[PDB]
Amino acid sequence: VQLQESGGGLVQAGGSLRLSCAASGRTFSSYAMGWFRQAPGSEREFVARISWSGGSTYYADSVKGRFTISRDNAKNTVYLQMNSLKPEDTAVYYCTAGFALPPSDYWGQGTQVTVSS
Amino acid sequence: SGNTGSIINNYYMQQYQNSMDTQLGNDWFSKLASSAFSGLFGALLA
Amino acid sequence: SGNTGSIINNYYMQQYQNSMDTQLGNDWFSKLASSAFSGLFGALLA
Amino acid sequence: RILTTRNGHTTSTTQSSVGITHGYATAEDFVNGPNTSGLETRVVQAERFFKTHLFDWVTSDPFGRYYLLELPTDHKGVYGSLTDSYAYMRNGWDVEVTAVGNQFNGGCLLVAMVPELCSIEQRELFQLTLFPHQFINPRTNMTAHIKVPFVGVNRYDQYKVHKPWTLVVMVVAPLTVNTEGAPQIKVYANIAPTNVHVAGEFPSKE
Amino acid sequence: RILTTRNGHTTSTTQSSVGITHGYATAEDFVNGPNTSGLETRVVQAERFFKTHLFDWVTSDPFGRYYLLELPTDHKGVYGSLTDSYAYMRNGWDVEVTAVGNQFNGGCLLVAMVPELCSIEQRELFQLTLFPHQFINPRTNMTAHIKVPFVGVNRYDQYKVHKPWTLVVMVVAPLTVNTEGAPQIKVYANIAPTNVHVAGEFPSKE
Amino acid sequence: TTSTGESADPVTATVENYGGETQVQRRHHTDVSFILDRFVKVTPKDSINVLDLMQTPSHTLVGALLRTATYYFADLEVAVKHKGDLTWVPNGAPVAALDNTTNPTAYHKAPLTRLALPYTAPHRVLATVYNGRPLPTSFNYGAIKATRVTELLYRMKRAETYCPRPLLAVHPSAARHKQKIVAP
Amino acid sequence: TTSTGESADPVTATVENYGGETQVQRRHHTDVSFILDRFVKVTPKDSINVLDLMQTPSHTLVGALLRTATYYFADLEVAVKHKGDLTWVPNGAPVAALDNTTNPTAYHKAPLTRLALPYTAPHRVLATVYNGRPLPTSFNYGAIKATRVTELLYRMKRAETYCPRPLLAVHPSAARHKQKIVAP
Amino acid sequence: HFDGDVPYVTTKTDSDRVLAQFDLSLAAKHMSNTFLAGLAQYYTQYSGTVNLHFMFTGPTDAKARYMIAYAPPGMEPPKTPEAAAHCIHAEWDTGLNSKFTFSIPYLSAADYAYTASDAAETTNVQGWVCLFQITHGKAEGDALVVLASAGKDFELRLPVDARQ
Amino acid sequence: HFDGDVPYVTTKTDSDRVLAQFDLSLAAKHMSNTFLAGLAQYYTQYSGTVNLHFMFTGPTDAKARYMIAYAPPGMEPPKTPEAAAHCIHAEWDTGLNSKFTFSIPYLSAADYAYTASDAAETTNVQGWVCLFQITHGKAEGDALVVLASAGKDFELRLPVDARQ
């Protein structure tokens, strides 16, 4: 079971990005989905979550209200819509699958995102 | 009592190798854990 | 049992020198080899 | 009034309970009949609970609202596979139904295990108490619990073409919130087979 | 030399038979271990034969022709469903292999139950008799029959990621028809589990 | 198995409820006296080192398991690698005493030197946490001095613990804590 | 002595058939526990070495006789020549543990250092061959670390073997295998 | 330990009845604050039962009914109570007694299991435990605090210093 | 192990009745694949009997009669059954029972004999064993598989690691 991030790139402050993650190898509608971010030199931190039903979510405080997570079980993919981007948000964004309240296991390779100012 | 592998008596008196305890006049937690209630509180069926 | 040459007791408790076995609830091949048939299957003559 | 029910490795616990209602008999009849030539066997691992949703009980439901549930139902556990691996089965049902509002809700429900239920008439519901039952009165209990044996014109039945038991849940009094109760009450069921026996292995699909 | 083997409701009969070979022990070890907390259960209906094809044994096969069969295999009966409904299983194997030419065929076969079979070397086949076995010599017997217990580093095994036993059939002498024998011999197997035990029900797909 | 949670009385349900069977336990490895008897490293100071069990790092196996009890008692074994002559002093003795060979002194013998020391404190039992950040000066086994000490170890004997306290593990970021385990 | 070969029942004919007499046997040297108890060399790795019996060469006397049993059990004795402090770790413990002196650690004492280690694996009995080329990570006695390890030896104790497997000799090209035998 | 860093889980009204779901391991994030998972980090292996305690905190006019279940390894854990009803499970509701206690069995191939979670382990070896909310009377916004402690047969061995 | 790398020897029709002939040693090429010669390489010396098992594979309409014989050292081994008939030998034929078992005696000056074969040894010290085909009914192209295993009194001592 393998994940692939996408939608990364470069942007300037106040911009927006939509990250895309595709899942493969097993039922995507049975898994919770979430994002992690590792800012360079800091340890990697948590971002956001979506339950398999798409009903429930949770957001890291710093990203709370700026970002919106959504999944498509039909399209076998999950989305993080990044809004009001801030130079702190520069990091590699890992797509994660999983069962647990935090999604944890089954990580993608992550995509690079650099917002500039 | 602790980690000790000698099957032969210690060469030095008990009074030297260790400090001698005194008296005056797992104890609590094992006596606590042994009283745990394993039962069913309500009537059993089948 | 193995290769051991000490005629005197081991200095350390059996509990340390070795791992302690437990129980639950050449064995097979010697009991197999002991059942080998050494006889003659047919009548003997002379 | 605490009651703990254990089937297999599964359990259920109810702090508000009126007890158990044993339908039609306390214990199963003779299992080993002349018709199976003694080739029947008991399946131990099949006896355990499984959960299903019934409906949502709301104030708008008048008297007479009823919900049929036929047993056995579609089952994805071990008990379901048996139905595909054996041409003859029998079992008793241990049924439990749970509707949780708070104690300030009002109205009442009647749950019953009705053998051979086909098109019961509207007037016939007034006599529905003839079958094994318990009332769910939110004033008192959140739980109804019923145990019934295997009934049928045969000693073993084929669950493809025949469903002997039908769980039915009827509204005897409509819900009332009175502003302190739950706005609506959801009804679930926790059901386990009992005394399952099987015979006559099928071949496989391959 | 008539022998009748009954497992469950299924049987097999062989008029030319050399007897049974009991591998590694006469009877199963302790079933109830500390690791399952006593939640294991025995499945009675799962013990019975099932048949599978091995290969076709022809004159062209030289010495060293071998056929691996790993156990358990894909099984569409009750025994197959268990593997999907229980996360831990154990069982012994009662294996029977049948190659029928007529008594005028020649050559010989060696069948063996080899625990933990991974990439046996060509030279290693000369010592293959170390494992439980019987010779199939068309001069004498059409049938080989082997009984072996459950072996493994665990008391219960997970048959998804581990197959403890591997049935292997090797040609010790090549076939010869001599004009009065069968032109080729087909090899089949009739296998039944024994002493099956399971634990740890999975959830279902629904 | 239902009960009143507010009671705080311990309630241990068992597998026999749904039809299991409880197995046999062997707890030797969690025994207090057993688990705490072994050497743990302490970063020394060049000359004078006060023997104190709280100097052990909090994350070490001996350090952590120590700090989970408010009130602890035990003897002490030390293993020291030093230059010169290692001089030991009992609790509450002046610092000026460490310079006297009359006090217990172990002449240098390679590779290192192991001693066994009694519990010398006046208090009936010592404490890991004291309400009065600092801990009172009277908690110590004494001090040792040498020309220089390269390594220092503590080994507790006859350990006894009282009034347990929180013991924390590492908090994972993901759903599990994944470490690389020894594999061939 | 004729019988049915297909039976697989063991049949041992004796010299008394043609009039010989069977002699007395003393098999001590082929006893499993006896023959497998001795040191065998393993090529170490500079720092971390996972203790594993399958690292022994297959042609060595201890290596070969080991691999002839699917399921084996035994304790372990190691003999190590190393620099620095040899640190041992039990089975299934994190690799980050080997850096703690609290874990068993043997300070360097020339020429070498011998330890005795218990059977630490969770599995009731280990295996030489596993069906699942790789063997599961849970088969090991733990690992040892030192600044550098020059030599490493394994000695099995209380060995027990199960379910034998092929044992191969060297295949001669000529009619015999001719080696130079020690002679004066 | 749960989301929002609170030691309780609140009743929810929606199509989603999964109240909380987590690995069975002593290295889990949920267990991380417990004392029981406190000792684990100093030992390699364990066996035996781990007990969970549930205490319903809501007001006297609110009633709910819950399900705890054990999902053994080898298959994805259940996302619905009807799917979980085939596992080993218990079910209880609120009433005079506020507390329920459930013993999670030790069920594994090998007689012992590692405390730590190996980095090469994608899916938990010991399986999951799942906590569901069957239904709730008027229980919106009411809290269920959960506790964990060793069982009768819980056994822990092979001390090791892992740092941490 | 035999020519063509097959563990059997086929009946032959010609003036040559020698079916198979080889040294008695545990270093022989024929023995090389056996388990018995597997242990030998780890021990210097042995004594006792080595059993050979013969199983006739041919069809029910073919009959043959065989001779196994032991040729002690000091003289060239026999090339004809009539020459071998003076040695220690056995003789059997095919029938209902398919298997024959023959014990090769341990006969030597010294109470033990080396497992390995010294390079300065031109002729085997333990002599030879010879397998002959007396005659065969209609047995052309029919196989005789042979096996080897330790006897009752077989004893093996002095472990050594020879590489190999």
Numbering used by the authors:
A (entry chain E): 5 to 86, 86A, 86B, 86C, 90 to 121
B (entry chain D), C (entry chain D): 15 to 39, 65 to 85
D (entry chain B), E (entry chain B): 13 to 218
F (entry chain A), G (entry chain A): 1 to 132, 157 to 208
H (entry chain C), I (entry chain C): 56 to 219
What's written in the study?
In contrast, M170 targets the surface along the edges of pentameric building block of the virus, nearby the twofold axis at a position similar to that observed for D6 antibody bound to EV71. When compared to M8, M170 primarily binds to VP3 via recognizing the “knob”, βC, BC, CD, EF and GH loops of VP3, covering most of the exposed surface of VP3, and VP1 C-terminus, which is way far beyond the previously reported antigenic site 4 within VP3. The M170 paratope is composed of CDR1 (residues 30–35), CDR2 (residues 53–56) and CDR3 (residues 103–110), which bury a surface area of about ~900 Å2 at the interface with VP3 and VP1 through hydrophilic interactions and hydrophobic contacts. The epitope of M170 mainly includes residues 57–59 of the βB “knob”, residues 71 and 73 of BC loop, residue 76 of βC, residues 78 and 85 of CD loop, residues 131 and 134 of EF loop, residues 177, 178 and 183 of GH loop in VP3 and residues 199–202 of VP1 C-terminus. In contrast to M8, M170 buries ~680 Å2 of the VP3 surface by interaction with the “knob”, BC, βC, CD, EF and GH loops as well as ~220 Å2 of VP1 via association with its C-terminal loop. Except for VP3 GH loop, subtle conformational variations in the binding areas for M170 are observed within these four serotypes and most residues necessary for M170 binding are not conserved. The specificity of the targeted region both in sequence and configuration explain the serotype-specificity of M170. In addition, M170 targets the HS binding site, occluding the infection mediated by sulfated sugars as well. In our previous study we reported that M170 specifically interacts with 146S particles, and cannot bind 12S particles directly. Remarkably and in line with the inability of M170 to recognize 12S particles, some residues of the M170 epitope, such as D71 and V73 in BC loop, E131 and K134 in EF loop, lie in the region with the largest conformational changes.
